[PDB]
């Protein structure tokens, strides 16, 4: 339907918000996307540790989950993600397993279990020839 | 001053299970009494006291000599009575 896409087809759009105004990010929808996975039974916390003040991200009127990033910026939630944040056991993400045992992981171990995407190229569609017959 | 001797089983545990990192011993203890709750009788009551490797091994010798004699009320039992809170009369064997 759309324009010619050499890589993949995009039948559904991500519905990107406009960048004329500042943008709220509502995370109350996140929990069931987080509750989905097999080993996860629930989540215990959802907050930010005072790293929003550099661009004055204000939480909107009453709800704890939403935050509004100021005009130009876009979220980068964990920059240089596993080695900087997730593996180091500083706790940006604290896993609690069997009451309290609270196990952790390194950087390279989760990349093997990470889904690796595939670069796909879309060749043009043609009808190949049949056998030429001497009707002449 | 409470009645302690009626229906109270004491389970002495190693503290090397808590020695593993990331334990949060309170959060582990919510799981430990979670499973063995079904294992105990309803009337039967459990307080636990967990200690280091060396005080466990001093208990581990005194329990077997207690059980090999056939549970006597002698000096082997009074050492176990000292090992808990409840206090014992050890004055006959002072040294």
XYZ file of N, CA and C in Angstrom:
693
model
N 0.804 -1.214 0.000
C 0.000 0.000 0.000
C 0.840 1.267 0.000
N 1.857 1.328 0.842
C 2.625 2.546 1.002
C 3.611 2.758 -0.119
N 4.712 3.430 0.194
C 5.780 3.555 -0.796
C 6.593 2.275 -0.849
N 7.470 2.188 -1.844
C 8.315 1.010 -1.989
C 9.342 0.942 -0.871
N 9.238 -0.096 -0.054
C 10.147 -0.325 1.055
C 11.099 -1.451 0.688
N 12.393 -1.135 0.643
C 13.393 -2.151 0.327
C 13.603 -3.094 1.506
N 13.446 -2.586 2.725
C 13.651 -3.361 3.942
C 12.332 -3.484 4.694
N 11.751 -4.684 4.672
C 10.551 -4.977 5.437
C 9.312 -4.269 4.908
N 8.193 -4.544 5.561
C 6.948 -3.837 5.302
C 6.371 -3.364 6.625
N 5.815 -2.158 6.612
C 5.303 -1.530 7.828
C 3.801 -1.318 7.677
N 2.969 -2.331 7.935
C 1.523 -2.137 7.747
C 0.869 -1.376 8.885
N 1.454 -1.420 10.076
C 0.985 -0.658 11.224
C 2.047 0.370 11.589
N 1.620 1.591 11.852
C 2.561 2.618 12.255
C 2.666 2.664 13.775
N 3.807 3.105 14.310
C 3.928 3.262 15.764
C 3.190 4.464 16.337
N 2.552 5.278 15.486
C 1.756 6.451 15.870
C 2.584 7.443 16.681
N 3.606 7.993 16.031
C 4.543 8.876 16.708
C 3.882 10.198 17.067
N 4.138 10.641 18.288
C 3.601 11.896 18.780
C 4.313 13.074 18.126
N 3.602 14.195 18.027
C 4.137 15.382 17.375
C 5.249 16.006 18.206
N 6.199 16.635 17.533
C 7.264 17.311 18.254
C 7.122 18.820 18.212
N 5.902 19.314 18.002
C 5.622 20.732 18.200
C 5.503 21.052 19.688
N 4.907 20.144 20.462
C 4.695 20.341 21.886
C 5.490 19.320 22.688
N 5.549 19.551 23.998
C 6.205 18.611 24.895
C 5.310 17.400 25.127
N 5.933 16.261 25.418
C 5.287 14.960 25.289
C 5.244 14.206 26.609
N 4.036 13.848 27.031
C 3.858 12.978 28.180
C 4.125 11.522 27.812
N 4.656 10.776 28.775
C 4.910 9.350 28.625
C 4.210 8.612 29.754
N 3.097 7.963 29.437
C 2.286 7.262 30.421
C 2.741 5.814 30.515
N 3.110 5.392 31.722
C 3.690 4.077 31.953
C 2.777 3.162 32.755
N 1.507 3.527 32.924
C 0.565 2.615 33.562
C 0.212 1.457 32.637
N 0.394 1.645 31.330
C 0.169 0.567 30.375
C 1.331 -0.427 30.377
N 2.481 -0.034 30.938
C 3.698 -0.842 30.871
C 3.607 -2.144 31.650
N 2.819 -2.178 32.728
C 2.964 -3.227 33.735
C 2.508 -4.577 33.188
N 1.471 -4.581 32.350
C 1.014 -5.823 31.739
C 1.945 -6.272 30.624
N 2.595 -5.320 29.949
C 3.672 -5.674 29.033
C 4.858 -6.240 29.799
N 5.015 -5.823 31.057
C 6.051 -6.388 31.911
C 5.568 -7.661 32.602
N 4.253 -7.774 32.844
C 3.692 -8.955 33.499
C 3.621 -10.136 32.543
N 3.824 -9.883 31.247
C 3.558 -10.875 30.217
C 4.530 -12.033 30.301
N 5.811 -11.746 30.544
C 6.867 -12.725 30.344
C 6.793 -13.806 31.423
N 7.369 -14.973 31.111
C 7.036 -16.219 31.800
C 7.481 -16.203 33.253
N 8.729 -15.809 33.501
C 9.251 -15.854 34.853
C 8.772 -14.706 35.720
N 8.195 -13.677 35.108
C 7.799 -12.506 35.875
C 6.392 -12.695 36.425
N 6.275 -12.637 37.750
C 4.998 -12.737 38.437
C 4.382 -11.391 38.780
N 5.192 -10.396 39.154
C 4.749 -9.018 39.334
C 5.962 -8.104 39.382
N 5.685 -6.805 39.425
C 6.698 -5.767 39.560
C 6.391 -5.053 40.875
N 7.414 -4.502 41.533
C 7.198 -3.951 42.866
C 7.310 -2.430 42.886
N 8.057 -1.840 41.952
C 8.272 -0.395 41.942
C 8.294 0.124 40.512
N 7.971 1.411 40.337
C 8.101 2.131 39.070
C 8.337 3.605 39.373
N 9.600 4.034 39.395
C 9.896 5.434 39.679
C 11.247 5.819 39.093
N 11.620 7.080 39.328
C 12.851 7.682 38.827
C 13.607 8.300 39.993
N 14.936 8.188 39.969
C 15.778 8.675 41.065
C 16.409 10.027 40.724
N 15.537 11.035 40.582
C 15.912 12.458 40.520
C 16.825 12.780 39.336
N 16.714 11.986 38.272
C 17.457 12.229 37.047
C 16.619 12.941 36.000
N 15.521 13.569 36.408
C 14.648 14.306 35.507
C 14.797 15.815 35.639
N 15.557 16.279 36.629
C 15.613 17.699 36.948
C 16.485 18.487 35.982
N 17.286 17.791 35.165
C 18.218 18.482 34.274
C 17.485 19.213 33.152
N 16.321 18.713 32.752
C 15.484 19.376 31.763
C 14.098 19.708 32.294
N 13.918 19.644 33.622
C 12.675 19.979 34.330
C 11.483 19.154 33.847
N 11.633 17.829 33.813
C 10.498 16.959 33.529
C 9.546 16.967 34.714
N 8.327 17.444 34.489
C 7.373 17.540 35.571
C 6.402 16.370 35.507
N 6.095 15.734 36.633
C 5.005 14.754 36.639
C 3.671 15.471 36.525
N 2.848 15.015 35.589
C 1.555 15.640 35.334
C 0.601 15.305 36.475
N -0.562 15.965 36.474
C -1.337 16.497 37.627
C -1.298 15.602 38.868
N -1.777 14.364 38.815
C -1.804 13.573 40.032
C -1.112 12.229 39.948
N -0.993 11.706 38.734
C -0.593 10.320 38.550
C 0.917 10.146 38.629
N 1.337 9.062 39.283
C 2.755 8.833 39.535
C 3.467 8.299 38.298
N 2.718 7.750 37.341
C 3.349 6.980 36.274
C 3.795 7.863 35.117
N 3.140 9.003 34.918
C 3.380 9.795 33.719
C 4.416 10.880 33.972
N 5.207 11.177 32.946
C 6.191 12.245 32.983
C 6.242 12.915 31.619
N 6.469 14.227 31.618
C 6.412 15.033 30.403
C 7.783 15.620 30.103
N 8.449 15.076 29.085
C 9.761 15.570 28.689
C 9.612 16.878 27.921
N 10.507 17.821 28.208
C 10.460 19.181 27.685
C 10.815 19.140 26.195
N 10.473 20.215 25.477
C 10.216 20.382 24.025
C 11.069 19.495 23.117
N 12.396 19.514 23.221
C 13.206 18.942 22.157
C 13.611 17.500 22.396
N 13.572 17.055 23.643
C 14.261 15.823 23.997
C 13.386 14.598 23.764
N 14.034 13.434 23.707
C 13.419 12.126 23.571
C 14.080 11.151 24.547
N 13.346 10.155 25.054
C 13.909 9.289 26.101
C 14.961 8.323 25.572
N 15.953 8.043 26.419
C 17.110 7.208 26.111
C 17.317 6.128 27.170
N 16.225 5.623 27.754
C 16.027 5.269 29.185
C 17.303 4.758 29.857
N 18.001 3.774 29.304
C 19.295 3.361 29.828
C 20.347 3.503 28.740
N 21.139 4.569 28.818
C 22.191 4.784 27.846
C 23.333 3.808 28.032
N 23.800 3.212 26.928
C 24.827 2.166 26.901
C 24.443 0.987 27.784
N 23.192 0.560 27.643
C 22.308 -0.171 28.540
C 22.901 -1.273 29.423
N 23.448 -2.398 28.926
C 23.722 -3.486 29.880
C 24.975 -3.291 30.719
N 26.079 -2.855 30.110
C 27.340 -2.676 30.815
C 27.296 -1.453 31.716
N 26.521 -0.439 31.332
C 26.461 0.769 32.143
C 25.464 0.607 33.283
N 24.330 -0.042 33.026
C 23.251 -0.082 34.003
C 22.922 -1.479 34.504
N 22.608 -2.417 33.608
C 21.845 -3.597 34.013
C 22.724 -4.661 34.659
N 24.006 -4.704 34.303
C 24.840 -5.819 34.744
C 25.575 -5.509 36.042
N 25.669 -4.232 36.410
C 26.672 -3.822 37.387
C 26.227 -4.041 38.829
N 24.951 -4.397 39.045
C 24.348 -4.590 40.377
C 24.462 -3.308 41.215
N 24.202 -2.177 40.570
C 23.859 -0.947 41.267
C 22.361 -0.858 41.522
N 21.573 -1.633 40.790
C 20.135 -1.580 40.867
C 19.441 -0.436 40.141
N 19.518 -0.369 38.801
C 18.425 0.312 38.086
C 17.243 -0.618 37.882
N 17.508 -1.922 37.857
C 16.502 -2.967 37.755
C 16.875 -4.067 38.733
N 16.088 -4.213 39.794
C 16.360 -5.192 40.834
C 15.445 -6.391 40.651
N 16.036 -7.537 40.323
C 15.324 -8.804 40.215
C 15.289 -9.449 41.591
N 14.100 -9.860 42.021
C 13.907 -10.569 43.278
C 13.393 -11.961 42.954
N 14.137 -12.980 43.367
C 13.797 -14.352 43.038
C 13.840 -15.210 44.291
N 12.760 -15.978 44.478
C 12.511 -16.837 45.634
C 12.625 -16.039 46.929
N 11.700 -15.111 47.127
C 11.686 -14.334 48.344
C 12.717 -13.228 48.378
N 14.002 -13.583 48.435
C 15.024 -12.564 48.561
C 16.381 -12.752 47.912
N 16.594 -13.847 47.168
C 17.948 -14.280 46.805
C 18.620 -13.278 45.867
N 17.832 -12.623 45.009
C 18.195 -11.385 44.305
C 19.428 -11.547 43.411
N 19.303 -12.436 42.426
C 20.451 -12.785 41.599
C 20.594 -11.780 40.452
N 21.804 -11.709 39.890
C 22.119 -10.778 38.817
C 22.946 -11.476 37.748
N 23.334 -10.698 36.736
C 23.881 -11.226 35.493
C 24.919 -10.228 34.980
N 25.760 -10.679 34.045
C 26.713 -9.792 33.393
C 26.159 -9.288 32.058
N 27.014 -8.577 31.316
C 26.572 -7.925 30.086
C 26.381 -8.934 28.964
N 27.377 -9.785 28.738
C 27.397 -10.597 27.528
C 26.470 -11.802 27.631
N 26.023 -12.145 28.842
C 25.248 -13.372 28.998
C 23.826 -13.194 28.485
N 23.315 -11.962 28.514
C 21.930 -11.738 28.117
C 21.838 -11.443 26.629
N 22.962 -11.085 26.005
C 22.946 -10.810 24.572
C 22.798 -12.092 23.766
N 23.259 -13.216 24.317
C 23.043 -14.497 23.655
C 21.581 -14.911 23.738
N 20.920 -14.598 24.854
C 19.496 -14.888 24.965
C 18.656 -13.738 24.424
N 19.302 -12.662 23.987
C 18.580 -11.554 23.381
C 18.137 -11.940 21.972
N 16.936 -11.545 21.552
C 16.554 -11.751 20.152
C 17.357 -10.847 19.229
N 18.122 -11.473 18.343
C 18.907 -10.766 17.344
C 18.060 -10.602 16.093
N 17.920 -9.363 15.635
C 17.159 -9.104 14.424
C 17.935 -9.564 13.193
N 17.240 -9.614 12.063
C 17.834 -9.988 10.790
C 17.587 -8.876 9.787
N 18.640 -8.462 9.091
C 18.469 -7.487 8.028
C 17.928 -8.170 6.784
N 16.764 -7.718 6.340
C 16.071 -8.317 5.210
C 15.912 -7.289 4.095
N 16.156 -7.755 2.871
C 16.033 -6.969 1.653
C 14.965 -7.605 0.780
N 14.130 -6.775 0.164
C 12.974 -7.244 -0.590
C 13.261 -7.141 -2.083
N 13.482 -8.290 -2.718
C 13.763 -8.343 -4.144
C 12.488 -8.077 -4.948
N 12.615 -7.562 -6.179
C 11.423 -7.310 -6.998
C 10.729 -8.596 -7.423
N 9.406 -8.520 -7.520
C 8.578 -9.669 -7.863
C 8.412 -9.719 -9.375
N 8.670 -10.890 -9.961
C 8.577 -11.091 -11.402
C 7.942 -12.451 -11.650
N 7.362 -12.616 -12.837
C 6.952 -13.925 -13.328
C 8.059 -14.461 -14.219
N 8.632 -15.601 -13.847
C 9.697 -16.186 -14.650
C 9.134 -16.755 -15.945
N 10.013 -16.952 -16.926
C 9.581 -17.470 -18.216
C 9.179 -18.932 -18.106
N 8.241 -19.340 -18.950
C 8.038 -20.747 -19.197
C 8.963 -21.256 -20.284
N 8.710 -22.482 -20.727
C 9.491 -23.032 -21.824
C 9.008 -22.463 -23.148
N 9.933 -21.906 -23.923
C 9.582 -21.349 -25.219
C 9.291 -22.457 -26.213
N 8.146 -22.358 -26.870
C 7.682 -23.396 -27.769
C 7.663 -22.869 -29.195
N 8.052 -23.731 -30.134
C 8.270 -23.329 -31.522
C 6.942 -23.333 -32.276
N 6.126 -22.325 -31.970
C 4.820 -22.201 -32.604
C 4.927 -21.422 -33.906
N 6.121 -20.924 -34.224
C 6.258 -20.041 -35.369
C 6.465 -20.779 -36.674
N 7.744 -13.467 81.380
C 7.989 -14.871 81.672
C 6.873 -15.725 81.090
N 7.208 -16.501 80.061
C 6.227 -17.272 79.315
C 6.516 -18.755 79.473
N 5.526 -19.570 79.122
C 5.695 -21.016 79.057
C 6.352 -21.342 77.723
N 7.532 -21.952 77.774
C 8.311 -22.236 76.577
C 8.436 -23.728 76.303
N 8.182 -24.559 77.311
C 8.556 -25.963 77.223
C 7.413 -26.853 76.753
N 6.255 -26.274 76.430
C 5.060 -27.093 76.245
C 5.047 -27.778 74.883
N 4.991 -27.000 73.809
C 4.799 -27.547 72.470
C 5.725 -26.850 71.478
N 6.958 -26.560 71.879
C 7.817 -25.682 71.097
C 9.049 -26.449 70.638
N 9.085 -26.774 69.346
C 10.225 -27.397 68.684
C 11.199 -26.290 68.310
N 12.484 -26.497 68.581
C 13.517 -25.563 68.154
C 14.384 -26.192 67.075
N 14.537 -25.473 65.967
C 15.311 -25.922 64.818
C 16.532 -25.031 64.672
N 17.710 -25.605 64.876
C 18.968 -24.875 64.779
C 19.508 -24.999 63.356
N 19.760 -23.854 62.733
C 20.020 -23.749 61.304
C 21.442 -23.219 61.127
N 22.106 -23.601 60.036
C 23.373 -22.972 59.689
C 23.148 -21.570 59.134
N 24.041 -20.652 59.491
C 23.996 -19.305 58.942
C 24.883 -19.139 57.720
N 25.437 -20.231 57.195
C 26.203 -20.139 55.960
C 25.280 -20.096 54.751
N 24.009 -20.449 54.940
C 23.030 -20.283 53.874
C 22.694 -18.812 53.682
N 22.800 -18.028 54.751
C 22.626 -16.584 54.658
C 23.921 -15.922 54.182
N 25.049 -16.637 54.270
C 26.346 -16.052 53.918
C 26.462 -15.792 52.414
N 25.632 -16.453 51.605
C 25.616 -16.204 50.168
C 25.140 -14.779 49.886
N 25.750 -14.083 48.921
C 25.471 -12.651 48.754
C 24.093 -12.389 48.165
N 23.606 -11.167 48.379
C 22.298 -10.777 47.899
C 21.141 -11.396 48.642
N 21.375 -11.890 49.859
C 20.432 -12.794 50.511
C 19.165 -12.067 50.965
N 19.311 -10.871 51.556
C 18.277 -10.221 52.359
C 17.607 -11.202 53.322
N 18.287 -11.562 54.448
C 17.861 -12.676 55.322
C 16.419 -12.656 55.806
N 15.837 -11.463 55.927
C 14.415 -11.364 56.232
C 13.560 -11.836 55.063
N 13.920 -11.436 53.840
C 13.142 -11.836 52.671
C 13.306 -13.320 52.377
N 14.477 -13.882 52.685
C 14.636 -15.330 52.611
C 13.785 -16.023 53.662
N 13.703 -15.437 54.859
C 12.998 -16.076 55.965
C 11.491 -16.089 55.731
N 10.994 -15.164 54.913
C 9.599 -15.235 54.499
C 9.359 -16.435 53.588
N 10.385 -16.867 52.852
C 10.222 -18.039 51.998
C 10.474 -19.341 52.760
N 11.395 -19.333 53.734
C 11.742 -20.571 54.439
C 10.572 -21.071 55.280
N 9.916 -20.178 56.026
C 8.744 -20.593 56.795
C 7.502 -20.724 55.915
N 7.591 -20.322 54.641
C 6.458 -20.447 53.723
C 6.190 -21.905 53.366
N 7.248 -22.672 53.093
C 7.064 -24.051 52.652
C 6.861 -24.996 53.833
N 7.682 -24.872 54.883
C 7.634 -25.824 55.992
C 6.472 -25.565 56.946
N 5.692 -24.509 56.702
C 4.450 -24.275 57.432
C 3.488 -25.448 57.288
N 3.370 -25.987 56.074
C 2.497 -27.129 55.831
C 3.064 -28.392 56.472
N 4.389 -28.457 56.611
C 5.030 -29.667 57.109
C 4.805 -29.860 58.605
N 4.641 -28.770 59.349
C 4.482 -28.889 60.789
C 3.030 -29.179 61.163
N 2.804 -29.800 62.319
C 1.452 -29.843 62.879
C 0.975 -28.459 63.287
N -0.344 -28.334 63.448
C -0.929 -27.033 63.757
C -0.618 -26.607 65.182
N -0.698 -27.540 66.126
C -0.407 -27.208 67.512
C 1.087 -27.054 67.733
N 1.893 -27.756 66.942
C 3.322 -27.800 67.198
C 3.952 -26.510 66.689
N 4.880 -25.963 67.467
C 5.299 -24.577 67.343
C 6.811 -24.509 67.200
N 7.289 -23.572 66.385
C 8.676 -23.558 65.943
C 9.311 -22.187 66.134
N 10.381 -22.133 66.926
C 11.306 -21.004 66.945
C 12.656 -21.508 66.458
N 13.339 -20.711 65.643
C 14.607 -21.114 65.046
C 15.711 -20.186 65.524
N 16.918 -20.731 65.643
C 18.080 -19.998 66.113
C 19.267 -20.419 65.260
N 19.779 -19.512 64.429
C 20.857 -19.860 63.510
C 22.139 -19.130 63.881
N 23.256 -19.863 63.845
C 24.555 -19.411 64.326
C 25.631 -19.750 63.296
N 26.878 -19.406 63.621
C 27.993 -19.527 62.690
C 28.403 -20.989 62.483
N 29.517 -21.179 61.770
C 29.987 -22.530 61.476
C 30.566 -23.207 62.712
N 31.211 -22.439 63.593
C 31.909 -23.054 64.717
C 30.952 -23.380 65.857
N 29.977 -22.505 66.113
C 29.006 -22.790 67.164
C 28.009 -23.851 66.718
N 27.854 -24.032 65.407
C 27.049 -25.141 64.908
C 27.760 -26.467 65.136
N 29.073 -26.497 64.897
C 29.824 -27.741 65.015
C 30.001 -28.148 66.470
N 29.985 -27.180 67.387
C 29.975 -27.532 68.801
C 28.625 -28.105 69.205
N 27.547 -27.628 68.578
C 26.248 -28.254 68.789
C 26.188 -29.620 68.124
N 26.867 -29.772 66.984
C 26.737 -30.990 66.192
C 27.390 -32.176 66.884
N 28.386 -31.914 67.727
C 28.961 -32.984 68.529
C 28.054 -33.336 69.699
N 27.463 -32.324 70.334
C 26.738 -32.556 71.577
C 25.385 -33.200 71.323
N 24.838 -33.037 70.118
C 23.558 -33.666 69.816
C 23.715 -35.166 69.622
N 24.837 -35.597 69.045
C 24.984 -37.010 68.725
C 25.312 -37.829 69.962
N 26.119 -37.274 70.869
C 26.390 -37.952 72.133
C 25.138 -37.995 73.000
N 24.270 -36.996 72.841
C 22.967 -36.991 73.494
C 22.073 -38.099 72.953
N 22.108 -38.323 71.639
C 21.208 -39.295 71.028
C 21.775 -40.706 71.102
N 23.100 -40.836 71.174
C 23.697 -42.161 71.308
C 23.478 -42.727 72.704
N 23.375 -41.856 73.708
C 23.088 -42.334 75.053
C 21.616 -42.692 75.200
N 20.759 -42.095 74.379
C 19.348 -42.408 74.434
C 18.526 -41.327 75.099
N 18.881 -40.066 74.824
C 18.342 -38.890 75.500
C 18.368 -39.007 77.036
N 19.542 -38.833 77.651
C 19.570 -38.741 79.110
C 19.391 -37.301 79.562
N 19.151 -37.134 80.858
C 19.052 -35.806 81.447
C 20.364 -35.337 82.055
N 21.483 -35.905 81.619
C 22.776 -35.614 82.195
C 23.415 -34.363 81.632
N 24.745 -34.409 81.539
C 25.513 -33.222 81.182
C 25.403 -32.903 79.697
N 25.048 -33.895 78.879
C 24.895 -33.653 77.449
C 23.643 -32.839 77.163
N 22.596 -33.031 77.966
C 21.359 -32.289 77.756
C 21.465 -30.873 78.298
N 22.211 -30.690 79.390
C 22.329 -29.366 79.992
C 23.202 -28.448 79.145
N 24.123 -29.024 78.371
C 24.885 -28.229 77.414
C 23.991 -27.736 76.287
N 23.056 -28.577 75.843
C 22.089 -28.164 74.831
C 21.128 -27.135 75.414
N 20.822 -27.266 76.704
C 19.957 -26.302 77.369
C 20.663 -24.959 77.527
N 21.994 -24.985 77.631
C 22.776 -23.753 77.652
C 22.835 -23.123 76.268
N 22.773 -23.952 75.223
C 22.945 -23.456 73.863
C 21.738 -22.647 73.407
N 20.589 -22.856 74.038
C 19.435 -22.015 73.782
C 19.379 -20.868 74.787
N 18.290 -20.103 74.715
C 18.045 -19.021 75.661
C 17.788 -19.539 77.078
N 17.250 -20.758 77.207
C 16.439 -21.133 78.369
C 17.254 -21.256 79.656
N 18.570 -21.415 79.548
C 19.437 -21.401 80.709
C 19.452 -22.724 81.456
N 20.620 -23.049 82.009
C 20.843 -24.363 82.598
C 21.645 -24.212 83.882
N 21.686 -25.301 84.654
C 22.483 -25.353 85.869
C 23.792 -26.065 85.562
N 24.849 -25.351 85.189
C 26.110 -26.021 84.845
C 27.114 -26.007 85.984
N 26.648 -25.701 87.199
C 27.560 -25.366 88.291
C 28.278 -26.594 88.846
N 27.768 -27.795 88.562
C 28.402 -29.006 89.080
C 29.686 -29.328 88.325
N 29.749 -28.957 87.049
C 30.893 -29.209 86.183
C 31.637 -27.935 85.800
N 31.886 -27.045 86.775
C 32.338 -25.635 86.660
C 33.506 -25.493 85.679
N 34.568 -26.281 85.797
C 35.696 -26.154 84.892
C 35.508 -26.862 83.563
